[PDB]
């Protein structure tokens, strides 16, 4: 996925999957 954003350990920015 190119849209996903890592924002913390084991966590992505909301709805970026």
């Amino acid at each position, epitope marked *: 996925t*190119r849209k996903s*954003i890592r924002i913390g350990p084991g966590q992505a920015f*909301y709805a970026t999957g």
Partner: antibody, heavy 124, light 109 residues
Framework: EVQLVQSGAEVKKPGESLKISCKAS????????IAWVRQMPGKGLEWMGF????????RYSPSFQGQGTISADKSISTAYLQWSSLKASDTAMYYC?????????????????WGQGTTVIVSS | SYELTQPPSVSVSPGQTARITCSGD??????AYWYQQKSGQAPVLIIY???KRPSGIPERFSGSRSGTMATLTISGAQVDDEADYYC???????????FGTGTKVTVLG
């Protein structure tokens, strides 16, 4: 060369509309979030919101919701920020920036490619 | 809404170590990022994911995060390191990014 080039300085009056632009080149425009950052004269950086050009997924910080519309036209690799009714308090430098372009910051939240900024003055 | 707090002013002499803190209640689970902004210039990313330097950024810049605080450290401060420094992170819900209030680092040259 990966690059974001912003439109030129603007001087407007309250109530007028304005659309400023951020032209991307040297990379796949659809695949990276583009953010807009406001900096009022002598103040700090404020994250307004960002857009993923592939599907135009657009998010705003709560205080910037409805205070400036972010959009993108991927056919000409350009992101935009616009107001239909400017206020004096919109006076600021505006930057656009790409998220996660370089190295291990790819897929991440660091804004690592920046436009040169657009100065906007709104005054009666 | 979510805010990241920074001291407004830090001063150092050349060769000394400057430390810049960033505090917020969502930091225990969210990465910190640091930006440097020199007078007249656009911001530059200097630290991402707490502690990682992009290439071209000098090793004298380091970062850490623990609990509600993230810290940017500038070892052996140089005159050209004088700038505004902004931390940056998301709210706990991961629905927006915010900048810290900014710290002016003065290097007494």
């Amino acid at each position: 060369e990966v690059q974001l080039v912003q439109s030129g300085a603007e001087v407007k009056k309250p109530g007028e509309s304005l659309k400023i632009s951020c032209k991307a080149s040297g990379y796949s425009f659809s695949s990276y979030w583009i953010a807009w950052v406001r900096q009022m004269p002598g103040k700090g950086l404020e994250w307004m919101g960002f857009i993923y050009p592939a599907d135009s997924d657009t998010r705003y910080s709560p205080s910037f919701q409805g205070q400036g519309t972010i959009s993108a036209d991927k056919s000409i690799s350009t992101a935009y920020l616009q107001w239909s009714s400017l206020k004096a308090s919109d006076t600021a430098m505006y930057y656009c920036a790409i998220l996660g372009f370089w190295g291990a910051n790819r897929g991440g939240g660091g804004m690592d490619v920046w436009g040169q900024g657009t100065t906007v003055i709104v005054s009666s | 809404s979510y805010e990241l707090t920074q001291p407004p002013s830090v001063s150092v002499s050349p060769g000394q170590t400057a430390r810049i803190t960033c505090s917020g209640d969502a930091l225990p689970e969210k990465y910190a990022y640091w930006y440097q902004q020199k007078s007249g210039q656009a911001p530059v990313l200097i630290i991402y994911e707490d502690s990682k330097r992009p290439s071209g950024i000098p090793e004298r810049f380091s970062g850490s995060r623990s609990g509600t605080m993230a810290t940017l450290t500038i070892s052996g401060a140089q005159v050209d390191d004088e700038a505004d420094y902004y931390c940056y992170s998301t709210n706990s819900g991961g629905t927006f990014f915010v900048f810290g209030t900014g710290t002016k680092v003065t290097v007494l040259g």
